User: What shape does this take?
Amino acid sequence: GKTGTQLLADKLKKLQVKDFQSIPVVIHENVSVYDAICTMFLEDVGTLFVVDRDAVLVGVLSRKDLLRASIGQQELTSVPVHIIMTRMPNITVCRREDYVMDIAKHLIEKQIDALPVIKDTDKGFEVIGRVTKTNMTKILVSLSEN
Amino acid sequence: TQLLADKLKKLQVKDFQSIPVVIHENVSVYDAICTMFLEDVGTLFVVDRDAVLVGVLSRKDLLRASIGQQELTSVPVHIIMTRMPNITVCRREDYVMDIAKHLIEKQIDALPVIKDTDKGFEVIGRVTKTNMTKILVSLSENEIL
Assistant: This one.
């Protein structure tokens, strides 16, 4: 590329998820909404990925979903999370080899803080990481130095 | 390459703000949760009778309050809000890299942008980890200087 900003853009475009992921926080689908909330504060995350008895991705839960559940008219804190989780038709994943910038674009478009990183297996998607707006914020800071 | 890095640190908040959402300090916790879903934002800025900033309330704090046992239809937000020793503000003239660092340490999604007036801190913007993420995307597309 011809200018220093173009060289910066080219490098940013090559960054891969495998290098900029966080550890994932995963709960089983039959854990209660209350237990999910406790896990969120225990682990200090704002998103949880939900898996089945084979540890395959079945759902995602955001802090907003849990607040909604907790404050509403129905008693939902006692129910299994699979009642309230976002399901697979509506879940976006990414893989280790994908580009960080393409994931950032998804975060912004889908108005969500985190995506799961998965590995394809014969049983479905195994969760191996998380990439978040916080990860992106860290990349931005690092640019200013080196 | 230092010089490029020196340019990045010169980018300012005014160019990468969002819309702030404000609530009065006497609103119930239930009413503030309602505002948070209506507005679809994750951080509320609390003001006093004089429209002066007195606190902040994140979605986390509201979840903390809701999975508790107080009559939150009763409880005014001043009871649980983070108060004005422990709040980090910024101004439109501040540098985005500075703010980004504060968002990271403090582990919060948003800071209030305020103006310094005759009356005190008046709220004029919000800056978030989404804003920072949008900057990173713009840089990757060569859409800034």
User: Anything to note?
Assistant: The interface with chain B takes residues 1, 4-6, 8-9, 12-13, 34, 37, 40-41, 44, 46, 63-64, 66-68, 70-71, 77, 101, 104-105, 107-108, 111, 113, 133-134, 136-141, 143-146 of chain A (CB under 8 Å). The two ends of chain A are 19 Å apart (CA to CA). The longest helix of chain A spans residues 4-14.
